[PDB]
Amino acid sequence: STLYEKLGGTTAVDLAVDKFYERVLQDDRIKHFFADVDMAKQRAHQKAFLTYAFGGTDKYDGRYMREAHKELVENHGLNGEHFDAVAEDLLATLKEMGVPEDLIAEVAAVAGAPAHKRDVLNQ
Ligand code: HEM
Numbered sequence: 222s223t224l225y226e227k228l229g230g231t232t233a234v235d236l237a238v239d240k241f242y243e244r245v246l247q248d249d250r251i252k253h254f255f256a257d258v259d260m261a262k263q264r265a266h267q268k269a270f271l272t273y274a275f276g277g278t279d280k281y282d283g284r285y286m287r288e289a290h291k292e293l294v295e296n297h298g299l300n301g302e303h304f305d306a307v308a309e310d311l312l313a314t315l316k317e318m319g320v321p322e323d324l325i326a327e328v329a330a331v332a333g334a335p336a337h338k339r340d341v342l343n344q
Pocket of ligand 1: 251254262265266269270273289293299303304307337
């Protein structure tokens with residue numbers, strides 16, 4: 222899988238997931254969501270988040286996605302502030318690696334698109 226070559230190696234890829242994983246638990250603001258959740262699923266969820274940010278989709282079909290995430294919005298009171306916290310954490314991880322600042326802005330723009338936030342937030 223030479224695709225990982227772009228990342229700069231597979232070792233670095235796992236390093237980001239491992240560190241990022243702890244950031245979620247470290248963040249008390251969203252820890253309640255992960256207070257009781259199977260770590261197995263989290264591995265995929267967190268992995269998808271990083272992958273989605275590096276290359277999200279302008280439009281995604283699937284009411285099911287909104288049905289679940291929206292449920293959190295009304296039941297747990299999830300808002301854009303929560304999303305920003307998770308996304309902000311990702312930016313910090315990139316800084317540690319030393320990725321040029323120019324890319325950090327572009328990377329955030331990928332998910333920054335409100336087109337993705339609406340599906341998740343379902344405002
Ligand atoms: C764009 C970002 C996100 C994507 C792409 C995404 C994607 C997914 C996907 C594919 C699932 C189904 C498989 C699974 O259980 O992980 C899922 C489930 C879930 N997501 Fe997300 N998610 C995102 C953001 C969030 C955020 C911000 C929260 C809340 C902080 C969240 C909370 C949940 C919960 C609680 C479930 C479990 C639902 C259940 O099966 O009972 N997700 N997410």
